[PDB]
Amino acid sequence: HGFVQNIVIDGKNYGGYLVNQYPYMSNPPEVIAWSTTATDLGFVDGTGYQTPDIICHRGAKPGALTAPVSPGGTVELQWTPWPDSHHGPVINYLAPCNGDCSTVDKTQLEFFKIAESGLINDDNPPGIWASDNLIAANNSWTVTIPTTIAPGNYVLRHEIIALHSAQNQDGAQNYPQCINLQVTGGGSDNPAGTLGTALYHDTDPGILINIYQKLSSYIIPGPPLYT
């Protein structure tokens, strides 16, 4: 359980959508992060993979603001403290807004995967995962925006999938957090995207899985990494 509370880009902080404050206040600030209704600090499990909730989390609406990113620049997402027990991959996607991200129809966003990290070491099951790397970095993840993609406005969909309960159907816990970015530079690729509701299924080999056994490999879920 947790959420993204801060985003560092080009030497400044952009405040995140504080889901344990803003849903209660009257009334909340504009930020680059999408609003959600996930005030339980919770997740979208397999029962919601083919619903709009999986796109940018439960009841999500676009952030009002968009943060520019230098060409090939980094975006550092800072989470509330992530539980060690909540082992799993950390995955990053971009979807073009083809306009102002603040007015997009989230159900039409076509995401392409720009980074993925999964099972790092399995010397001691359930092992060390991307989420553990995130914890070790003081609850932080650094995403590098590709220099090869068409500049424009994009939604970054940043996500941890916790697998500690994934042995049973619909047991995996997805924690997507979306923010709005302005990608800059001289790239030209428009990578093939995937609708949010088509990213995952509750029987994927990296979703329906027993992480407590010895694993020789791990298939990170979602569409192929863009390279």
Ligand SMILES: [Cu+2]
């Ligand atoms: Cu949790």
